[PDB]
């Protein structure tokens, strides 16, 4: 009743009073203001110069309720723009929040965890500053228990989420030592039964694997690929999405790292992923496939054994344009490193028609890719004297009829590739 709908000035009045209880009430009012459905007056609160006051209340062990209120208020301010988050950091909140992680009051240390999450999530710089202030040990200590299941559901979700932000951002990526520190715990969270924890854990792994092969390696080295393939089959889209991104990232690495997801049985899930109702999953899955077709011939052979070429043909034939483009890539990569027998199989699966149909697309990049593929296939037929038979097939379904049309195309690389095909393989 007395902390509902206060005006910023009343809040300032109470916070500036010489009464701790008056400050507590004013702070709770500030918090409720910052927690209203929409458009919380974050800037008004900031201009009033309240951040420094809140930060100081964080250090009042004697009055844990004001620690909590100011923590919640600061958390919400920190959830705004970079400028608003900067305001919190500039108030000296980082060290103060790290100290609260040790609080005896779970709901208070949890608020500190959340705030640290908002601060780190802003970007690389604040992320690394939080780490430099020593946040990782306290955070990890909060999860150092025999069974994660004994922790409050929300409490676990907040730590997991905050840890995933410490793994987030790329320019630069989190410090290597910090990653190593966090990884073990992350590996444990990846085996927890709560879906939100799994989703955020997968997001964390997806961030760590979004980079150079050395980065992917320290993750693969932890033995999480199998757990990821498992989560890849999850029924909850919020889990499958980040899991698929992690698996997709890992196969952008070395052939050896890519072999790890294959050995884990990832390919068996793709007939489903490649036909997934969610356009995005379908796109990420086809992209993931494209990098797998850019691997060794024995890996392209796995794609073949799992019967995934027909699914690629299917996705090249009908799907969101972005997914089709990813399909084009998977094909051009496949033809590029595949054996003759494998390229013949691709043709036998019906790759030609859908491939030709895309040549009518308004996108110079995809056309280049498709032309490349056409070239790669002809080169395989060249090795069998079947070049002619191929020309017919491409001829049979308006293929040549489209390559000539592009022979006049504007793009440098295009008309060239176009031309060569018309002469070197036709008339």
């Amino acid at each position: 009743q007395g902390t509902v709908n206060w005006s910023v000035e009343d809040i300032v009045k109470g916070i500036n009073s010489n009464n701790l209880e008056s400050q507590l009430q004013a702070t709770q009012a500030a918090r409720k203001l910052l927690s209203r459905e929409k458009q919380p007056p974050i800037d008004n609160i900031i201009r009033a110069g309240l951040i420094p006051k809140f930060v100081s209340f964080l250090g009042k062990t004697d009055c844990s309720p004001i620690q909590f209120e100011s923590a919640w208020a600061l958390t919400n301010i920190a959830s705004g723009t970079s400028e608003q988050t900067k305001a919190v950091v500039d108030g000296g909140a980082i060290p103060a929040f790290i100290s609260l992680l040790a609080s005896p009051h779970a709901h208070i240390s949890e608020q500190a965890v959340w705030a640290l999450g908002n601060i780190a999530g802003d970007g690389s710089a604040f992320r690394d500053l939080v780490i430099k202030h020593g946040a990782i040990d306290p955070l990890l200590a909060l999860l150092a228990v025999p069974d994660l299941s004994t922790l409050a559901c929300g409490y676990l979700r907040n730590l997991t989420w905050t840890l995933s932000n410490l793994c987030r951002n790329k320019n630069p990526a989190p410090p290597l030592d910090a990653v190593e520190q966090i990884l073990p715990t992350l590996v444990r969270l990846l085996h927890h039964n709560d879906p939100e924890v799994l989703a955020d854990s997968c997001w964390a792994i997806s961030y760590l694997t979004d980079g150079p092969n050395e980065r992917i390696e320290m993750v693969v080295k932890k033995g999480v690929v199998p757990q990821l393939v498992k989560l890849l089959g999850a029924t909850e889209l919020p889990i499958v999405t980040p899991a698929l991104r992690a698996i997709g990232n890992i196969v952008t690495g070395t052939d050896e790292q890519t072999q790890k997801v294959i050995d884990a049985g990832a390919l068996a899930v793709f007939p489903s992923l490649l036909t997934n109702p969610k356009t995005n999953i379908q796109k990420e899955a086809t992209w993931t496939m494209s990098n797998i077709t850019a691997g060794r011939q024995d890996q392209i052979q796995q794609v073949v054994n799992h019967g995934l070429v027909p699914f690629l043909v299917g996705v090249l034939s009908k799907a969101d344009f972005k997914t089709q483009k990813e399909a084009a890539w998977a094909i051009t990569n496949y033809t590029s490193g595949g054996t003759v027998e494998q390229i013949v199989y691709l043709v036998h699966c019906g790759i030609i028609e859908p491939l030709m149909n895309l040549l009518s697309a308004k996108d110079t990049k995809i056309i280049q890719v498709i032309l490349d593929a056409i070239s790669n296939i002809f080169q395989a037929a060249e090795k069998l004297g079947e070049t002619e038979k191929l020309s017919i097939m491409i001829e049979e379904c308006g293929g040549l009829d489209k390559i000539e049309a592009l022979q006049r195309h504007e793009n440098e690389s295009v008309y060239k590739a176009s031309l060569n095909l018309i002469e070197k393989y036709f008339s």
Binding site: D122, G123, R245, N291
Partner: peptide, 20 residues
Amino acid sequence: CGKRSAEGSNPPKPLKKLRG
């Protein structure tokens, strides 16, 4: 030619969370 990095949005999780 080969591996093409994961590039472009997603869009991933929100960077921050306001507590209602």
